[PDB]
């Protein structure tokens, strides 16, 4: 009937008739019955596919692309389009200046990518990725939302597609969208593409350099929770590669605020992102402390209880913030003023796992740099626990990776914290009373330079008291200390020499 005739008309050599045949078909695809009749005719669908990628009459390309769009709403329509080689033709239409054509084309491809088995490979092979990325400079937000979603589908779990997106400049184009538009669906769809690319070692650096961290940060206070969460996940995946970025003030401020959220995922992500951004960046450390980050992190730790997915990064962030920057001292004091000492010391005990214990020990070492923390840390029972951890870890090294942590790291960390705590006379008495001198002397023989340093260090602090200096000598520390005198490590050499001077000072008067 109509289909056969229309099909023939579309194949007609007289271009004037095809354009007239296209309108009729497009008009028929708008009705249930006739639509199904079209999709069940391989010849009809093939003609439409040919007419579309050949015509030069705007209205013809529009009616054919529009017809395919309508058919793509059905399973049979999707299959027919697929089998008729419609994908390559649709990808070609992505180069059309006519918005009407482009919209029909990208939407049809979107339906194929979402439901038609085999569509993804076909689109990749047809060069659809490069075409889609190039269209990201358009300004129609609904069009961009569909295009970016297509990119998400094509990139998900496909490294090859992620690399093509990168080579096409996808990162900068995607970041630009995040900084330019306010349409929620587009921001969300784009954040999902960025999330997929953020786990790729090649795209990650490119996203960061394009200003991705700052752009994603602009949306962390959006009412849309799906948008906020996707930005947070992406930011966290990217964070380990963003410690050198500038203009992070705004993002840092918002992350600190999010630490007070009741949403566990928001809190966990915010803590994780802050942990990495405070790594070796004094400006970031300064800003985080400036906006009340210490208090917020302490509260986060308090509320988390035994949830290590939260306490671990929060504790690492605190460790970073209480060291090597103009405000470290203030931060060390702040942790105490906000009632954080009791909880920090608590984390040294079970059920805490090794990673968290290691971070906690490192934090305590930094907190001990503040004299006002010496007594309260002692009063929380930190010293016997640090000593117990040290002894067990040392024995383990004498008899490799435990939960991802080497026991040599625990030995070094605990001896290091005891070294700082030993600056206080009352702490020295507790430390010495736990019969630790014999152990410290043995650590002098460690092959690990940093262990030699903190062992000599704690012995040095202990040696400032006459009796302790005598007890250290009684333990045969002289020989191992003498060997450390030619160490390349100034610290090791200085602490060792200091213990020797303090030991031979006491009474050693005349000769004999």
């Amino acid at each position: 009937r109509a289909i056969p005739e229309l099909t023939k008309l579309l194949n007609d050599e007289d271009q004037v008739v095809v354009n007239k045949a296209a309108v009729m078909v497009h008009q028929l695809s708008k009705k249930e019955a006739s639509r199904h009749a079209i999709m069940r005719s391989p010849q009809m669908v093939s003609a439409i596919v040919r007419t579309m990628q050949n015509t030069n009459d705007v209205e013809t390309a529009r009616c054919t692309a529009g017809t395919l769009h309508n058919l793509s709403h059905h399973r049979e329509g999707l299959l027919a389009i697929f089998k008729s080689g419609g994908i390559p033709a649709l990808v070609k239409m992505l180069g059309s200046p006519v918005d009407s054509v482009l919209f029909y084309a990208i939407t049809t491809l979107h339906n194929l990518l979402l439901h038609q088995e085999g569509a993804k490979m076909a689109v990749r092979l047809a060069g659809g990725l490069q075409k889609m990325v190039a269209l990201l400079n358009k300004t129609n937000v609904k069009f961009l939302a569909i295009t970016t979603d297509c990119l998400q589908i094509l990139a998900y779990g496909n490294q090859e597609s992620k690399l093509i997106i990168l080579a096409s400049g996808g990162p900068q184009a995607l970041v630009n969208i995040m900084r330019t538009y306010t349409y929620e669906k587009l921001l969300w769809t784009t954040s999902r593409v960025l999330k997929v690319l953020s786990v790729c070692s090649s795209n990650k650096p490119a996203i960061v350099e394009a200003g991705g961290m700052q752009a994603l940060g602009l949306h962390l206070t959006d009412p849309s929770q799906r948008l906020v969460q996707n930005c947070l996940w992406t930011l966290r995946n990217l964070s380990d590669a963003a410690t050198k970025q500038e203009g992070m003030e705004g993002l840092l401020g918002t992350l600190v605020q999010l630490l007070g959220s009741d949403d566990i995922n928001v809190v966990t992500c915010a803590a994780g992102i802050l942990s990495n951004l405070t790594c070796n960046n004094y400006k970031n450390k300064m800003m985080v402390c400036q906006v009340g980050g210490i208090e917020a992190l302490v509260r986060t730790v308090l509320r988390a209880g035994d949830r290590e997915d939260i306490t671990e990064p929060a504790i690492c962030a605190l460790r970073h913030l209480t060291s090597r920057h103009q405000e470290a001292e203030m931060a060390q004091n702040a942790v105490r003023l906000h009632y954080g000492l009791p909880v920090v010391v608590k984390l040294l005990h079970p059920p805490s796992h090794w990673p968290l214990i290691k971070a906690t020990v490192g934090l305590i070492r930094n907190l001990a740099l503040c004299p006002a923390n010496h007594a309260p840390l002692r009063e929380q029972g930190a010293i016997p626990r640090l000593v117990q951890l040290l002894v067990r870890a040392h024995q383990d090294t004498q008899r490799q990776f435990v939960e991802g942590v080497r026991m040599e790291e625990i030995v070094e960390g605990c001896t290091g914290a005891l070294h700082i705590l030993a600056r206080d006379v009352h702490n020295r008495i507790v430390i010495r009373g736990l019969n630790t001198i014999p152990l410290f002397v043995q650590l002098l023989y460690s092959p690990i330079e940093n262990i030699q340093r903190v062992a000599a260090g704690v012995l040095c602090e202990l040696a400032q008291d006459k009796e302790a200096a005598e007890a250290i000598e009684a333990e045969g520390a002289t020989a191992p200390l003498t060997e450390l005198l030619h160490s390349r490590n100034e610290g090791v050499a200085t602490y060792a020499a200091a213990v020797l001077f303090r030991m031979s000072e006491d009474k050693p008067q005349d000769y004999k």
Binding site: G157, N158, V196, S198, N366
Partner: protein
């Protein structure tokens, strides 16, 4: 010079470095530095790598290609 003098110069150097590293000196050491202020000033006319922070790789990719 002599062994005795070498000892003094070495002790002064160690004590000055120890104070610079942030450790307190004993009363007898402070006294020692006064007794040999000459050696001290003589040397006065002659560190980092600590709590370095480590990033956590939170990224976790999907599967295949």
């Amino acid at each position: 010079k002599s062994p005795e003098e070498m000892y003094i110069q070495q002790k002064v150097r160690v004590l000055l470095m120890l104070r610079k590293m942030g450790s307190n000196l004993t009363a007898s050491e402070e006294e020692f530095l006064r007794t040999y202020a000459g050696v001290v000033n003589s040397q006065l006319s002659q560190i980092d790598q600590g709590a370095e922070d480590v990033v956590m790789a939170f990224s976790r990719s999907e599967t295949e290609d």
